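Obj: model holo form, ligand = INN.
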Amino acid sequence: PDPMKNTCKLLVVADHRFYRYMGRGEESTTTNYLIELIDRVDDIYRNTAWDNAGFKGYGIQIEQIRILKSPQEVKPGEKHYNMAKSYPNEEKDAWDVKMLLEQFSFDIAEEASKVCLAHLFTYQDFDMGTLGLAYGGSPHGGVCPKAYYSPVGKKNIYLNSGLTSTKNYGKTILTKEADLVTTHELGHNFGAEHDPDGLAECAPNEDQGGKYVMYPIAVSGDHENNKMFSQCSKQSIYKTIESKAQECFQERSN
Ligand SMILES: CC(C)C[C@H](CC(=O)NO)C(=O)N[C@H](C(=O)N[C@@H](C)C(=O)NCCN)C(C)(C)C
Ligand SMILES: [Zn+2]
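Output (holo structure tokens):
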């Protein structure tokens, strides 16, 4: 690994929802939560041997934390990821998660072109227990800004983004749970797809340590494998990490 290029710098954004409900309406409380979360998530990444050998030391660090203290005032018909109402159903507490990710990508496109990854932290109750979403490892996107011209948006947007909500079923999720969501979404950004039941090695039984972080069904984090990447995820991220490090990875600060 190139110690000069082993860290994916992040642009972390907290919308007014997160600021109010998670940060208690205080910058200090909001940034502290995020700084500590990314650090724990980083511990997972830095310590992972993508090649089960010496290809490790790769992780994430926050470059900028943007805090949107109040909803984004918009003109009728116009939408923004930080606006007060949910879209498309203003009656629901949350946006359709997919449309929200696209909107976030559209709105922070300018800032996203200057970073390895952009991650939105919000506080809205997504339907059917969904906690987050991200580009990369699908059916393109992920680490390092890749342009995509949006016909509807009339500009280039970048697919190096993801989001995490710390609210599910009417309550704030446990910090141990939030860590898992971000690790999983960032996992997608790093190229990992979900672990398939078809490969036991990548989706063990509860008596074998449980499932790994990229399993599609949320894992409380009370089982051993829960906060680790399976061999399937490792292989994917390993392939991705190589062709990408030189492109946008930087040197770890500290
Ligand atoms: C951290 C997890 C892995 C993220 C995924 C979504 C995903 O794959 N993001 O990239 C999720 O929220 N999964 C939900 C989940 O497991 N949520 C749990 C809390 C749930 O609703 N469990 C009860 C089922 N009614 C689904 C969509 C499966 C309901
Ligand atoms: Zn997923």
